Amino acid sequence: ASSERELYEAWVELLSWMREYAQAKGVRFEKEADFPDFIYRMERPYDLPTTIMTASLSDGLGEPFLLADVSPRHAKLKRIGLRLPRAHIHLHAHYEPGKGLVTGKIPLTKERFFALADRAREALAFA
């Protein structure tokens, strides 16, 4: 729908939370990659909130412990995704009108996220 537009808007947010947690707890944030459908977009138009598509909260050695990404504008079955590497944990966040950002039925709030990030940082960071 135009819920697509709202998803990316939320993905911008999810990123702002990441950058916050990053500088907050003293651990590295890194843009992993930008949307190809932007880089190789030419005269073609683009009205998406960012270029950033894959991001990570990495540790001292650089090894990521949180991985977030949203699906490119031209793709199908769009979802914004969380992945705790090395620990077989994958979260697929969708978007519902009026309710908000959800992982199924449960909302994904700045609180809940920050929680997930910590659990991972504390148990999964190498340095």
């Binding site: 992993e32 990659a33 190809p36 880089i39 190789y40 598509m53 894959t54 990570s56 990495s58 050695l61 650089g62 090894e63 990521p64 991985l67 990404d69 699906s71 490119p72 793709a75 199908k76 079955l77 769009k78 979802r79 995704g81 992945r83 590497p85 090395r86 077989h88 994958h90 190498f126």
Partner: protein
């Protein structure tokens, strides 16, 4: 020595020979991703498929030419539509989750994935041709993350040949790399951080793609742009 007919060419070839090396020796070709000079063949990626007859009686399922041995009086078809159609698909699968970096990717025009993609991929059936069938979200992970000061690893690119990990346990004997989770999620990782062995640099030269790359020469020139000068290293006696 053994009598083996490739397509239309017949060739003598020692007893414990690879059907693959049979084909190449006859002067033919097949998509080659996981096998490697000096490393244990395993039929991993499944590119070097062929068809085999052995009496003519046609084997029911296609074979991994890289791990099937030659036998006396063996026909090896590497041109049948059935075969091309299969390689075509296998290539499609390999490209299915890849990251779209080429112009920016340091693997330049010296990349086994590109070449075979162009070489065998996109099957000609017999209207507007379709370059890509898979319209879903690609696999996104870690990227441009240096394992040591000399090797920079890009997990996203990796195609899961076993070349690097396999090399490590075999040539140097220093297991400092190996796949992590399973399924579509597996990836190359380590827990021995410096990449200890004094022979790590070779994985850069084996890696079919741009995952394992020489960081010492990151982003200098594209691979054709370089002026190659064959010579001898004289740092030590070997």
């Amino acid at each position: 020595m053994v009598r083996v007919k490739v397509n239309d060419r017949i060739v003598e070839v020692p007893p414990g020979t690879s059907v693959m090396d049979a084909v190449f020796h006859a002067g033919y070709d097949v998509p080659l991703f996981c096998s490697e000079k000096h490393l244990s063949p395993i039929g991993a990626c499944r590119m070097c498929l062929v068809r085999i007859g052995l009496p003519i009686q046609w084997q029911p399922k296609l074979a991994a030419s890289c791990v099937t041995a030659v036998a006396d009086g063996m026909v090896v078809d590497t041109l049948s539509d059935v075969v091309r159609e299969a390689q075509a698909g296998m290539v499609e699968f390999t490209l299915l989750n890849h990251p779209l970096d080429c112009p920016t990717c340091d693997k330049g025009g010296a990349c086994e994935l590109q070449d075979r993609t162009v070489e065998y991929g996109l099957y000609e059936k017999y209207e507007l041709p379709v370059y890509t069938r898979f319209e879903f979200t690609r696999r996104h992970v870690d990227k441009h993350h240096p394992l040591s000061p000399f090797v920079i690893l890009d997990r996203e690119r990796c195609i899961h040949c076993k070349r690097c990990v396999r090399y490590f346990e075999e040539v140097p004997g220093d297991e400092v790399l190996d796949f992590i989770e399973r399924g579509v999620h597996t990836f190359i990782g380590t827990m021995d951080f410096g990449l200890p062995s004094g022979f790590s640099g070779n994985i850069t030269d084996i890696c079919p793609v741009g995952a394992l790359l020489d960081l010492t020469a990151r982003f200098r020139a594209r691979n054709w742009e370089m002026e190659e000068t064959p010579t001898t290293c004289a740092l030590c006696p070997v």
